[PDB]
C-alpha cells in the first residue's frame, strides 16, 4: 500500500506528537533535539503474524 504522511503514529505519546501540527510536520521554528519526530510517516505492513 501507499505510505501516509499522516500525523497518526502508533505508539507515541502526546509529548511526541506535540511538536507536530495537525498534518504531521514539525512547526517552523520549533527547536528539536535527538529523537524528536520531524515528519510523521507510516507504511502499510499487513498480517503481522504474532
Amino acid at each position: 500500500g501507499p505510505e501516509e504522511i499522516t500525523a497518526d503514529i502508533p505508539n507515541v505519546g502526546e509529548a511526541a506528537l506535540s511538536k507536530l501540527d495537525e498534518s504531521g510536520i514539525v512547526y517552523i521554528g520549533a527547536e528539536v533535539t535527538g529523537g524528536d519526530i520531524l515528519v510523521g510517516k507510516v507504511t502499510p505492513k499487513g498480517e503481522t503474524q504474532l
Binding site: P2, E3, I5, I25, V26, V32, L38, V39
Partner: protein, 50 residues
C-alpha cells in the same frame, strides 16, 4: 514510486569542543585538548589572560 517528499532544514549551532582541528596559516595543525577556565590562564602584569 514516490508519492510525496518532505524536506526539513535544521540549523544546528555548534561552538567548539575537544577534538576539533585547528590551524594557523603557517601549517601548524592542532586538536583542542582541554577547555581551561579563565582563572588558570597565564596572565600578564596588567591582568589580561591569554
Amino acid at each position: 514510486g514516490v508519492l510525496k517528499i518532505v524536506k526539513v532544514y535544521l540549523a544546528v549551532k555548534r561552538r567548539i569542543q575537544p577534538g576539533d582541528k585547528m590551524a594557523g596559516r603557517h601549517g601548524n595543525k592542532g586538536v583542542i585538548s582541554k577547555i581551561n577556565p579563565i582563572e588558570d590562564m597565564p596572565y600578564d602584569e596588567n591582568g589580561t589572560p591569554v
